[PDB]
Design a binder for this molecule. Structure first.
Ligand SMILES: CCCCCCCCCCCCCCCCCC(=O)O[C@@H](COC(=O)CCCCCCCCCCCCCCC)COP(=O)(O)OCC[N+](C)(C)C
Ligand SMILES: CCCCCCCCCCCC(=O)SCCNC(=O)CCNC(=O)[C@H](O)C(C)(C)COP(=O)(O)O
Lengths: 27, 109, 51, 615, 73, 84, 247, 50, 69, 47
C-alpha cells in the first residue's frame, strides 16, 4: 500500500472551524 | 407448595455454578489432557445428589457448594480481551452514534 | 498448509523458515566454537594464557 | 555534528506532530524513522571517534539559570560512558521505529505514535548526554512524561488511564529523592555541574541537620540519589507501576519497559560514580535493595500467565541485579549487563509482540497452546533471546551473569554474601519461568480456538529486520565486549567510571574462583529446566493443580497478587489520603470549622445583635 | 463525524493524495534547517584531548589540542 | 473481518450438538431444543455453550447465558454478536 | 476571574517583598519559623483538599493557592536566589493560572456545566483545545523546560540552604501536584466520550487560538531562557537581601 | 486486613535471611589478604599532600 | 438535538450544589472535635517544634547561641 | 475419554491433532542437524 494514492481530497476538518468562503474572495 | 419459582431458582443456580466451575476448571487446568478428567470429576460431583426434592435439603447444599467453590478462584481467570475486563476492552470503540460539530461559533453580527 | 476440520493452517513463507534455520545453525555452531577455543578458560582445567 | 545527534529526533517529532495531516500514516513513519536512523548513524560515528579514539567531547550552548554561582548551562558531556549508551539508545530506538510501522499499519492514530517515540528519544538523549544535575533532571522528568504519554496512547482504554496516572504518581514519589539530591549536593559544593564535583568530591567530611537528627552529608546525598533511582528502576520501594505498565501498545513497550528507561536509574549511579564510592553506607543499602528487588521479581514472574506481565518481572529482576552491580563499586558488570539486556530483552519483546499481534491479539499462557512449527523464524529468535536470558555457557548473557555472580561471591561484606545468596537462589527462579514461557507456549497441544489458527499470518519482512539485527547482536556482542571493557584495567573509560583503590576486587574474582561456585548457576539453570519440563509437559496430573484444603490456594494468591502490595499500599496510603482529604481538611480545617467566620458563621450573629438595638 | 474535527496532528487514517510530495518537502525541510545547527556547532565542541588516531572531524572543527592550559580561563 | 453470514454458521453451530453423544445425530434440527425434543440432561445445558464458545470466540453474559435453551437462540445470538 | 489569580493575587505576596522584608529586618528573622509552619502545612492541606473536588474552576484556584503558599516559603527564606526564584515563580504562575482559567472557561462558554462529571472524552473532538490544555497542565504539573520549574527549583534551593525540614515539606507540594492536575486532565479531555450530555460542541476558533499564543511563547521563553528576567533584577534582589546587617 | 499479615511474613523472610548472613561471618572467611599499594597506599594519587 | 448546553440531570445537580455548602453538617459532633484537635492544633504545633529544633541544632553546630524567636 | 462429558469435549476438538503439527518434539530444537555438521567440518579440516 506504499504506491496507491491517498483516498482524501482535502485534510479533514476546518482550521479554527472557519468554513472557507467561495473561491476568489479573501477571508 | 406447587410453586416452581423456588425450583426454577435452583435450576438456575445449578447451571450458573456448573458454568463457573467449568470455567475455573479450565483456568486451573492449564494443560487440557488433565482438563478432561477434571471436567469429568466436576460433572460427576454435580450428579452425586441429583435427586433433591425437599426445600430444607437444598439451601444447605447450595451454601456448601458456594463456599467450597469460592475457596479456589484462580486469581487470574480467563477474560476475553475485548470482553468487559480483557486486555483490549475499549481498544478502538465505535464512535458515538449521534454527535454533530458546529463550525461558525464565536462570530459576531 | 493443507486445510483440516478447523485448523486451516497457512504454511510459513519461504524466507520465514530457511532464514530461521540458517541463522539458528550459526548460533549452534558458535556455542561449540566458543566451547573449543575459549572453552578451556572456565572449566577448572588447563587455564589458558600461559598456564 | 554532535548537536545533530540530539536535535534531529526532536526536529522530526516536532515536524511530524505539527504536520501530521500533511503527511500520511506512512509519510511520518518513513520520515521520523529515517531521522532516528540518521541519529543512530551519527551515534555510531561518535562511538568510533570517542570509544576507540579516546578523546571525550565537551561543549556548552547557553546559560540556562544564570543566577549567582549557580551556573546552569545547556552543555552536554559526550564522554566515553555516555557514548556507549548513545549507541544503546539510538540503535534500539531506530529498530523499534522500524518495528512499529508494521504493527501500527492497522492502528489508526499512527503518526502520533512515532511523534511520541521521537519525543522519548530526544528526552533520553538529552538525559544521557547531560552534564548538570538540573539539566539531567529535565531528561529524568521527560522520560516519565513520555512513558505516561505512551502508556496513555489509548485514551478510550480505561485501564490504560489509571495505569498511566498511577505510574506518574509513583515515579514522582520515586524521583522525589533525586530531586532532593540535586540541591542536597549543591549546599556542600555551591555548584551543580559534574566536572567540578568529580574533581573534588571526597573532600567534604562534615554532617548536617536533617528533619529529625544530624546524620552524614555525602551518605545522605547518595541515599537521596538512590531513592530517586528507585522510582525509575522499579526497586523494592516503588515498583507498583512496571507490572501494570503493559496496558498500552507493544512496540513502545520494547523501548520503555525493557530497553532504555530501564537504564535511567542504573545510569544515575553509573554517571555519578565518584560520589557513591565515597559514601560506603549508601552502597550497602543499595546492595540490599537491589538484591531484594531482584529476588522479589524473580519469584513474582513465575505464577503469572501473560506474555508481557511475566517478562516485566524478568526486567525487574535484571534491574535488581544491575542495582547490586552498582552497589558493590563493580560498575563494570553493571554497564555490561545493561548493554546485554538492551539486546536480549528488546529482542524478546519484539518476538512476543510478533507472536501476539499475529494471533488475533491474544497474550495468554492458559489459553494459547503450541504453534511452533507454524512459523520458525520468530521462535528461533525468541529461543536465542531466552538462551541469552538464562545465560547459557559461552553466550552473551553468560558473560554478564557469571561475572556479576562471581563478584557478588567475592566481596565478603555483610551485603555481598547475602546478596550473592539471593542472586544464586534467584537464578533458579529465572531459569524456571523463562523455560516455563518456552514450554507453556509452542511446546504444548494447542488449547486456543479454531478461528484464530485459520487466521494466521507470520511476521512481515519490515518488522523482521530489527529482530534479525538484534539476533546478530546478542550472539557476538558479549564475546566482543568481554575483553575490551571488563579486562582488568582497560584504558578507554578514563574519567568516565572511577573505582576507588580500596574497593577494587576484580582480579581475585577470576584468579581466586573455587570453580565449585563459578559454574553453579548453570547447575541451577539445568535443574530449573528439568523441573519446568517435568511439571509443564509430563508430570502435571498433580503437580499443576492443587485442590487442597488451605494454605495452598492462599499461596497461589500471595504471588499472583504480588505480595498484596497493590492492596496494602493502596488501602493504607492512597485510600487514606483520599478519605482524609475530604473528611479532615475539608471538614475540620477550612470548610465547616473556620467557616464559622464566613457565611452562616457571623451572618446570623448580626441577625440578633443588630435586631435588638432599635428598641 | 471524524471529518468535522480538524485533528491538527492528522486524522485517524489521514491519507493525503500527494503525501509523497509533502514527505519530500518535509525531508527537504529538515535538511535545510539542519545545516544551521551543524554550522553553528562548528564554533563549539571544545575537546582539549588529542585522539591517538585521526578522526574525520578535523575539517569542520579546530577546537581540539588548543585549550591546553587552564591558567588563563 | 469477513463477518460470516448465516450460510457458514448453520453448519458450525449444529455440529456442536451433532458431536454430542447423548443426543442421536439422526434427528438433529437447526430449530430444536434439547429439553424435550432431543432428550438431554438438565446439567449438560451449559456444556454445549462452553463447546460453542471454544469454537466462536464470544462469551455471553451469565445473566442470559442459560436463557438459550434452544439451538435457534444460540445461532441467532452468535450471528447477532459482531466479534464472534 | 482570570485576574483574581492574575494580578489581584500578587499584591500581598509582592507586598511582602517591598514593605515587609527590607522594612522589618529584625522581625522577619524572629517570625521565620511561623511562616514556614504555616506555608508548609498549607501546601499539604490545600493540595489534599484539591483532590476531592468536582467543580472545574475550584481545582485550578486550589492549585493556585498551593503555588502561592510555596512561593511564600521561598520569599521569606532570605537568599539572593530564593527571592529571584520567588519572582520567577510568581510571573510563571501569573501566566499559567491565567491560561488555565481561560482553558476551563472556554468550556463553560459553550456548555455551561462547570462539572467534571459531564466532561469526558474531549480528545476525540476539539483536539487543539486538548493539546493546549495538556501543555498548560504540564506547565502546572511542574515540569522542567517550562517557566514554573525554574520558579520552584530556586524556592527549594533557597529553603533547603536555610532549613532542611521545610524543603522536604515544600517538595511534597510538587509531588502532590501530580495527583489532582493530571487526574483532572485525564478525567476531562481523555475519558470515554458520552453523547448523553455533550450532544454537540465546537473547537477553538481564531480568537482563543490566538489568545494562548502569547501565553505559550512567554511560557517557553521564560522556561528555557530565564536569563533576561534574572539579568534585569539581580541588583535589586541583592540590595533587598542585604539590608540592616553589614556582614 | 488479612493481607497485612502476609505482608509481615513476606518482608520477614527477606530481613530474616539478611540476618542469617550475619550469623556466618563471611568477612573473616577471606582466603586472601587486604590489597596494598605502593607509596602509602597511593597517597599522592588519592589526595593528601605532595 | 440543537442544544449545545448540558442536560443538567437532576440527580447530579444536588450532588454538585450540596458539597458546595457543608456548614450545616459540620457544626458540632464528636468526631469533628477529635479531627480538629489532632490535625489543626496538633500537627502545626509538632511541625513548628520540629522547625525550631532544627534551627537550634543548626545554631549549635556553628556554635552561636540559639535565638529566642 | 469417559466422563459423560469428556468424550463430547475430546470428540468435538479432534482437530487439535493436525498431523503436520501433531507434536513439536523434533521442532523444539531446529538447528541441531546443521550446526553439529558445520562444527565437525570446521574441526576435522584444520588439523
Ligand atoms: C516537559 C514539557 C516539555 C514541553 C512540552 C511539550 C512536549 C510535548 C507535549 C505534547 C505532546 C503531545 C500531546 C498532545 C495531546 C495528546 C492528546 C491529544 O489531544 O491528541 C491530539 C493532539 O495530537 C498531538 O499529539 C499533537 C502533538 C503536538 C506537539 C508537538 C510538539 C512536541 C515537541 C515540542 C517540544 C519543545 C521543543 C523545544 C522547544 C525549544 C490529536 O491527536 P489525534 O491523533 O488527532 O487523535 C484525536 C482523535 N481524533 C482524531 C478523533 C480527534
Ligand atoms: C474449583 C471449583 C470447582 C467447584 C467444585 C465445588 C462445587 C460444589 C460441590 C459441592 C456441592 C455440589 O455437589 S453441587 C450439586 C448440585 N446439584 C443439585 O442441586 C441437583 C438439583 N436437582 C434438580 O433440580 C432436579 O433433580 C432436576 C431438575 C431433575 C435436575 O436437573 P438440574 O440439576 O440440572 O437442574
Amino acid at each position: 500500500r506504499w504506491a496507491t494514492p491517498g483516498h482524501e481530497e482535502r485534510p479533514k476538518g476546518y482550521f479554527m472551524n472557519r468554513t472557507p468562503p467561495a473561491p476568489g474572495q479573501s477571508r | 407448595a406447587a410453586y416452581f419459582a423456588r425450583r426454577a431458582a435452583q435450576k438456575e443456580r445449578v447451571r450458573i455454578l456448573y458454568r463457573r466451575a467449568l470455567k475455573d476448571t479450565l483456568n486451573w487446568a492449564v494443560h487440557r489432557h488433565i482438563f478432561y478428567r477434571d471436567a469429568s470429576d466436576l460433572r460427576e460431583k454435580f450428579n452425586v445428589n441429583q435427586d433433591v426434592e425437599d426445600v430444607d435439603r437444598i439451601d444447605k447444599l447450595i451454601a456448601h457448594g458456594e463456599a467450597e467453590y469460592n475457596k479456589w478462584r484462580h486469581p487470574d481467570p480467563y477474560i476475553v480481551p475485548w470482553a468487559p475486563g480483557g486486555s483490549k476492552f475499549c481498544r478502538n470503540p465505535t464512535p458515538p452514534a449521534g454527535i454533530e460539530i458546529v463550525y461558525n461559533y464565536g462570530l459576531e453580527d | 498448509g493443507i486445510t483440516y476440520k478447523g485448523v486451516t493452517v497457512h504454511t510459513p513463507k519461504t524466507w520465514h523458515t530457511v532464514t530461521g534455520k540458517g541463522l539458528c545453525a550459526v548460533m549452534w555452531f558458535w556455542i561449540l566454537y566458543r566451547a573449543k577455543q575459549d572453552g578451556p578458560v572456565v572449566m577448572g582445567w588447563r587455564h589458558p594464557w600461559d598456564g | 555534528m554532535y548537536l545533530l545527534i540530539v536535535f534531529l529526533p526532536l526536529l522530526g517529532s516536532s515536524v511530524a506532530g505539527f504536520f501530521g495531516r500533511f503527511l500520511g500514516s506512512e509519510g511520518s513513519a518513513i520520515m521520523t524513522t529515517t531521522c532516528v536512523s540518521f541519529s543512530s548513524i551519527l551515534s555510531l560515528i561518535a562511538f568510533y571517534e570517542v570509544a576507540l579514539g579516546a578523546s571525550a567531547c565537551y561543549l556548552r550552548i547557553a546559560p540556562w539559570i544564570s543566577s549567582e554561582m549557580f551556573d546552569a548551562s545547556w552543555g552536554f558531556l559526550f564522554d566515553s560512558l555516555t557514548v556507549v549508551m548513545l549507541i544503546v539508545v539510538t540503535f534500539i530506538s531506530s529498530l523499534v521505529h522500524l518495528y512499529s510501522i508494521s504493527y501500527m499499519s492497522e492502528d489508526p492514530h499512527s503518526p502520533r505514535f512515532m511523534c511520541y517515540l521521537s519525543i522519548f528519544t530526544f528526552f533520553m538523549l538529552m538525559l544521557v548526554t547531560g552534564d548538570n544535575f538540573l539539566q539531567l533532571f529535565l531528561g529524568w522528568e521527560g522520560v516519565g512524561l513520555a512513558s505516561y504519554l505512551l502508556i496513555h496512547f489509548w485514551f478510550t482504554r480505561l485501564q490504560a488511564d489509571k495505569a498511566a496516572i498511577k505510574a506518574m504518581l509513583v515515579n514522582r514519589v520515586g524521583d522525589f529523592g533525586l530531586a532532593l539530591g540535586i540541591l542536597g549536593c549543591f549546599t556542600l559544593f555551591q555548584t551543580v555541574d559534574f566536572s567540578t564535583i568529580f574533581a573534588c568530591a571526597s573532600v567534604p567530611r562534615n554532617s548536617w541537620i536533617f528533619c529529625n537528627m544530624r546524620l552524614n552529608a555525602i551518605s545522605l546525598i547518595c541515599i537521596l540519589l538512590f531513592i530517586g533511582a528507585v522510582g525509575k528502576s522499579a526497586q523494592i520501594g516503588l515498583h507498583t507501576w512496571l507490572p501494570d505498565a503493559m496496558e498500552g501498545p507493544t512496540p513502545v513497550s520494547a523501548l520503555i519497559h525493557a530497553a532504555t528507561m530501564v537504564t535511567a536509574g542504573v545510569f544515575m549511579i553509573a554517571r555519578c560514580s565518584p560520589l557513591f564510592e565515597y559514601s560506603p553506607t549508601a552502597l550497602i543499602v543499595i546492595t540490599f535493595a537491589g538484591a531484594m528487588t531482584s529476588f522479589l521479581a524473580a519469584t513474582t514472574g513465575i505464577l503469572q500467565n501473560d506474555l508481557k506481565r511475566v517478562i516485566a518481572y524478568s526486567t525487574c529482576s535484571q534491574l535488581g541485579y544491575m542495582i547490586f552491580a552498582c552497589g558493590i563499586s563493580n560498575y563494570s558488570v553493571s554497564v555490561f549487563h545493561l548493554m546485554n539486556h538492551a539486546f536480549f530483552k528488546a529482542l524478546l519483546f519484539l518476538s512476543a509482540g510478533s507472536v501476539i499481534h499475529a494471533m488475533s491479539d491474544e497474550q495468554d499462557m492458559r489459553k494459547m497452546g503450541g504453534l511452533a512449527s507454524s512459523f520458525p523464524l520468530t521462535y528461533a529468535m525468541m529461543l536465542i533471546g531466552s538462551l541469552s536470558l538464562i545465560g547459557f555457557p559461552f553466550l552473551t548473557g553468560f558473560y554478564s551473569k557469571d561475572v556479576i555472580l562471581e563478584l557478588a561471591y567475592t566481596k565478603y561484606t555483610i551485603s555481598g554474601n547475602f546478596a550473592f545468596w539471593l542472586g544464586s537462589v534467584s537464578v533458579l527462579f529465572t531459569s524456571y519461568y523463562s523455560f516455563r514461557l518456552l514450554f507453556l507456549t509452542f511446546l504444548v497441544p494447542t488449547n486456543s480456538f479454531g478461528r484464530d489458527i485459520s487466521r494466521c499470518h507470520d511476521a512481515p519482512i519490515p518488522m523482521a529486520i530489527p529482530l534479525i539485527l538484534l539476533a546478530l547482536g546478542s550472539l557476538f556482542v558479549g564475546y566482543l565486549a568481554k575483553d575490551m571493557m571488563i579486562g582488568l584495567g582497560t584504558n578507554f573509560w578514563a574519567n568516565s567510571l572511577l573505582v576507588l583503590p580500596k574497593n577494587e576486587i576484580l582480579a581475585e574474582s577470576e584468579f581466586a574462583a573455587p570453580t565449585i561456585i563459578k559454574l553453579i548457576p548453570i547447575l541451577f539453570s539445568t535443574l530449573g529446566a528439568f523441573v519446568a519440563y517435568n511439571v509443564n509437559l509430563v508430570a502435571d496430573q498433580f503437580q499443576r493443580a492443587f485442590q487442597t484444603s488451605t494454605f495452598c490456594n492462599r499461596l497461589y494468591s500471595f504471588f499472583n497478587k504480588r505480595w498484596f502490595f497493590d492492596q496494602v499500599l493502596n488501602d493504607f496510603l492512597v485510600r487514606s489520603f483520599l478519605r482524609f482529604g475530604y473528611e479532615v481538611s475539608f471538614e475540620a480545617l477550612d470548610k465547616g470549622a473556620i467557616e464559622i467566620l464566613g457565611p452562616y458563621g457571623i451572618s446570623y450573629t448580626f441577625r440578633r445583635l443588630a435586631e435588638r438595638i432599635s428598641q | 463525524f471524524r471529518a468535522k474535527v480538524w485533528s491538527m496532528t492528522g486524522g485517524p487514517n489521514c491519507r493525503p493524495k500527494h503525501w509523497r510530495r509533502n514527505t519530500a518537502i518535509a525531508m527537504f525541510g529538515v535538511f535545510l534547517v539542519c545545516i544551521p545547527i551543524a554550522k553553528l556547532s562548528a564554533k563549539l565542541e571544545q575537546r582539549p584531548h588529542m585522539p591517538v588516531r585521526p578522526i574525520p572531524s578535523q575539517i569542520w572543527c579546530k577546537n581540539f589540542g588548543t585549550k591546553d592550559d587552564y591558567e588563563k580561563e | 473481518d469477513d463477518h460470516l453470514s448465516r450460510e457458514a454458521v448453520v453448519d458450525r453451530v449444529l455440529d456442536v450438538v451433532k458431536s454430542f453423544p447423548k443426543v442421536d445425530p439422526s434427528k438433529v434440527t437447526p430449530e430444536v431444543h434439547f429439553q424435550n425434543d432431543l432428550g438431554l440432561d438438565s446439567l449438560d445445558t451449559v456444556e454445549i455453550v462452553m463447546a460453542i464458545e471454544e469454537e466462536f470466540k464470544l462469551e455471553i453474559p451469565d445473566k442470559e447465558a442459560d436463557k438459550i435453551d434452544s439451538c435457534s437462540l444460540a445461532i441467532e445470538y452468535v450471528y447477532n454478536h459482531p466479534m464472534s | 476571574s482570570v485576574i483574581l489569580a492574575g494580578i489581584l493575587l500578587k499584591f500581598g505576596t509582592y507586598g511582602f517583598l517591598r514593605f515587609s522584608i527590607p522594612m522589618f529586618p529584625e522581625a522577619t528573622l524572629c517570625f521565620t519559623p511561623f511562616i514556614y509552619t504555616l506555608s508548609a502545612i498549607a501546601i499539604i492541606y490545600t493540595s489534599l483538599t484539591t483532590l476531592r473536588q468536582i467543580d472545574l474552576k475550584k481545582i485550578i484556584a486550589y492549585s493556585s493557592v498551593a503555588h502561592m503558599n510555596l512561593v511564600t516559603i521561598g520569599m521569606f527564606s532570605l537568599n539572593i536566589q530564593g527571592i529571584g526564584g520567588s519572582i520567577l515563580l510568581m510571573l510563571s504562575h501569573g501566566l499559567v493560572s491565567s491560561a488555565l482559567f481561560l482553558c476551563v472557561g472556554v468550556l463553560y462558554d459553550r456548555h455551561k456545566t462547570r462539572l467534571v462529571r459531564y466532561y469526558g472524552g474531549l480528545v476525540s473532538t476539539m483536539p487543539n483545545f486538548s493539546t493546549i490544555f495538556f501543555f498548560f497542565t504540564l506547565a502546572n504539573m511542574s515540569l522542567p523546560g517550562t517557566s514554573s520549574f525554574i520558579g520552584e527549583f530556586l524556592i527549594l534551593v533557597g529553603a533547603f540552604q536555610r532549613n532542611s525540614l521545610v524543603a522536604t515539606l515544600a517538595a511534597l507540594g510538587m509531588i502532590l501536584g501530580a495527583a489532582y492536575s493530571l487526574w483532572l486532565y485525564n478525567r476531562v479531555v481523555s475519558g470515554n466520550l458520552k453523547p448523553d450530555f455533550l450532544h454537540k460542541f465546537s473547537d477553538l476558533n481564531g480568537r482563543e487560538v490566538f489568545i494562548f499564543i502569547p501565553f505559550l511563547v512567554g511560557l517557553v521563553w521564560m522556561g528555557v531562557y530565564p536569563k533576561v528576567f534574572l539579568d534585569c533584577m539581580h541588583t535589586s534582589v541583592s540590595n533587598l537581601v542585604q539590608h540592616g546587617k553589614f556582614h | 486486613y488479612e493481607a497485612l499479615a502476609w505482608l509481615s511474613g513476606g518482608l520477614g523472610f527477606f530481613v530474616g535471611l539478611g540476618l542469617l548472613a550475619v550469623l556466618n561471618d563471611k568477612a573473616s572467611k577471606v582466603p586472601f589478604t587486604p590489597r596494598v599499594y605502593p607509596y602509602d597506599n597511593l597517597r599522592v594519587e588519592l589526595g593528601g599532600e605532595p | 438535538g440543537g442544544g449545545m448546553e448540558t442536560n443538567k440531570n437532576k440527580f447530579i445537580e444536588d450532588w454538585g450544589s450540596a458539597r458546595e455548602n457543608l456548614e450545616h453538617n459540620f457544626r458540632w459532633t464528636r468526631r469533628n472535635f477529635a479531627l480538629i484537635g489532632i490535625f489543626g492544633i496538633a500537627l502545626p504545633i509538632i511541625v513548628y517544634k520540629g522547625i525550631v529544633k532544627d534551627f537550634h541544632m543548626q545554631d549549635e553546630d556553628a556554635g552561636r547561641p540559639h535565638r529566642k524567636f | 475419554p469417559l466422563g459423560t462429558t469428556g468424550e463430547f469435549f475430546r470428540r468435538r476438538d479432534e482437530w487439535r491433532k493436525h498431523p503436520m503439527l501433531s507434536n513439536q518434539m523434533r521442532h523444539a530444537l531446529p538447528g541441531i542437524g546443521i550446526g553439529v555438521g558445520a562444527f565437525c567440518v570446521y574441526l576435522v579440516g584444520e588439523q
